[PDB]
């Protein structure tokens, strides 16, 4: 694997998780973070892994929100779990 792309994807996973733990919950805060995550992941590999599709679902869902909608406290908790699981599975692929 291209080591620079692996470092960039790994940094992006932790950055989105840290954002969620800091209470970022709006479309305009989360969309760019998830966008850059998904781009960096594809740079490493285009292969499937656990929860890859789920993270795609989330960025599609977040894109359809109106300007100033937030995720619910329990939506945030779900997305965090799904991200943690994707991160574990991406790391196993390495």
């Amino acid at each position: 694997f291209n080591a620079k792309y692996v470092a960039e994807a790994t940094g992006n996973f932790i950055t989105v998780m840290d954002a969620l733990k800091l209470n970022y919950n709006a479309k305009d805060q989360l969309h760019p973070l998830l966008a850059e995550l998904l781009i960096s992941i594809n740079r490493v590999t285009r292969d499937d892994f656990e929860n890859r599709s789920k993270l795609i679902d989330w960025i599609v869902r977040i894109n359809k929100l109106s300007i100033g909608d937030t995720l619910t406290e329990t939506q945030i908790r779900e997305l965090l779990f799904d991200l943690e699981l994707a991160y574990k599975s991406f790391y196993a692929l390495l």
Binding site: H31, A35, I39, R43, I56, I59, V60, N63
Partner: protein, 47 residues
């Protein structure tokens, strides 16, 4: 007119004008709203 497939969500998009490595800003996917990464998208581009 340029057609392409989003490398994030896989939906077909259509944009006005050429889509080359020099186009800036890049077109945005209508479905997931991610700006198209040229290197990931280039094999799918037709004009």
């Amino acid at each position: 007119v340029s057609t392409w497939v989003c490398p994030i969500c896989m939906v077909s998009n259509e944009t006005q004008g050429e889509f080359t490595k020099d186009t800036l800003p890049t077109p945005i996917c209508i479905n997931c709203g991610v700006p198209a990464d040229y290197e990931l998208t280039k094999s799918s581009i037709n004009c």
